[PDB]
Design a protein around this ligand. Structure first.
Ligand SMILES: [Zn+2]
Ligand SMILES: [Zn+2]
Ligand SMILES: [Zn+2]
Lengths: 263, 46, 65, 41
């Protein structure tokens, strides 16, 4: 469809190894940054501690809670708490969850993220569900209790972005490479005896044509064709991270044309 | 109801004022702990 | 204290693989390296996260008060 | 018999309770089993 060009190599519920082509490095890189820091998501951002006899401090547990990946499928149908016209929080802008655990058995009692319970009305939108990916349906191990120890909390999820705090980040890592063959000469290889022999060859060198001995430096060739690979943290489908990233960046660029308008 | 002070070892809830010495019941320990308040504490999950 | 929820460097959820790492060692008698790799942890930043953890809560739990 | 003076005891010395305490006994006494103990209180 003319313009940017996607060419997926791998795909799954966790990673999207693809190949952006026919685009400026800037755009490629801008998208890379947006996926990392500006894609809306839901995450614990308030914890009320009623009972805590655990070996961990409140802020310690609180901190971890906020790091628990939460379902953010329909995150767009959840207003930012700072915008919402209510007082503090409500179902229109926040998801409330509870955690109640008691050291009953004699063996250590594990408090996972599955033990979290939504207490607010989700209104039918896929949101707030603690993400689970372990072959045991336990999820993230929040804390541990000895017989007698108790923990009664109340978390208030909220929509946020990574820029404000990494917890709100939907992405994990983002492989990024271009010109596996240093034809553009964007880098000067360090060596002892042999540049090529000492430097490991990249995966993407296969997906490209090795330079030819005689050909003089192609001083016009620019930087297009970037070999990426996104990895979702779970709060959002892998493909979504990309798509929504592309969309978010698109919004920013638009928020500026609108500024020129009312200017 | 209530639980002003708590014992260090037996963890048995105590509660007394002045002239009431500074011990606990059964356990002659003289430590005692303040016991967390009821006013719920809020936290920034950041 | 306990398995950090995410890896400091990339954020990849790692705080849901402690018990698995442990079993992969005792029950399956696998070596640390071969174990972390089977947990999806390929980049040394995530690998170190688990391989270097110290589950001090176990000893903490051993107290009564 | 007669009582004369008081001597402060060096933790984990023969005369100290912790010296014999097992890893478990130490935990109950709210004393870290990693404490080396060559000092006085
Ligand atoms: Zn609201
Ligand atoms: Zn007592
Ligand atoms: Zn990592």
């Amino acid at each position: 469809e003319e313009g940017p060009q996607v060419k997926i190599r791998e795909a799954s519920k966790d990673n999207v190894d693809f190949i952006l082509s026919n685009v400026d490095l800037a755009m490629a890189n801008s998208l890379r940054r947006v996926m990392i820091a500006e894609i809306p998501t839901l995450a614990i951002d308030s914890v009320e501690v009623e009972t805590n006899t655990t070996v961990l401090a409140d802020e310690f547990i609180a901190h971890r809670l906020g790091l628990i990946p939460l379902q953010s499928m329909d995150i767009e149908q959840l207003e930012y708490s700072r915008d919402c016209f209510c007082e503090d929080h409500c179902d229109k802008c926040s998801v409330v969850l509870t955690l109640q655990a008691f050291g009953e058995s004699e063996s250590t009692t594990n408090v996972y993220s599955k033990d979290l319970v939504i207490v607010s009305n989700l209104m039918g939108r896929n949101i707030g569900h603690p993400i689970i990916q372990d072959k045991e349906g336990n999820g993230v191990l929040i804390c541990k209790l000895r017989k007698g120890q108790e923990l009664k909390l109340t978390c208030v999820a909220k929509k946020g972005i990574a820029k404000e705090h990494a917890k709100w980040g939907p992405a994990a890592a983002i492989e990024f490479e271009y010109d596996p063959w240093n034809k553009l000469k964007h880098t000067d290889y360090w060596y002892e005896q042999d540049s090529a022999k000492e430097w490991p060859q990249s995966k993407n060198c296969e997906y490209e044509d090795p330079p030819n001995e005689g050909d003089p430096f192609d001083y016009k060739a620019q930087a297009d064709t970037f070999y990426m690979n996104v990895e979702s943290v779970g709060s959002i489908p892998v493909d979504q991270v990309v798509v929504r990233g592309i969309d978010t960046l698109q919004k920013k660029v638009a928020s500026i044309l609108l500024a020129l308008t009312q200017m | 109801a209530t639980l002003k002070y708590i014992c260090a070892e037996c963890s048995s809830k105590l509660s007394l004022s002045r002239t009431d010495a500074v011990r606990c019941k059964d356990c002659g320990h003289r430590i005692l702990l303040k016991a967390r308040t009821k006013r719920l504490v809020q936290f920034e999950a950041r | 204290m306990i398995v950090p929820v995410r890896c400091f460097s990339c954020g990849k959820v790692v705080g849901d693989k402690w018990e698995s790492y442990l079993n992969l060692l005792q029950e399956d008698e696998l070596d640390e390296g071969t174990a972390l790799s089977r947990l999806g942890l390929k980049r040394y930043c995530c690998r170190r996260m688990i391989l270097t953890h110290v589950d001090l809560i176990e000893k903490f739990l051993r107290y009564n008060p | 018999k007669v009582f004369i003076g008081r001597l402060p005891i060096m933790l984990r010395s023969k005369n100290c309770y912790l010296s014999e305490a097992t890893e478990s006994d130490l935990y109950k006494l709210k004393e870290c089993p990693f404490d080396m103990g060559g000092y006085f209180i």
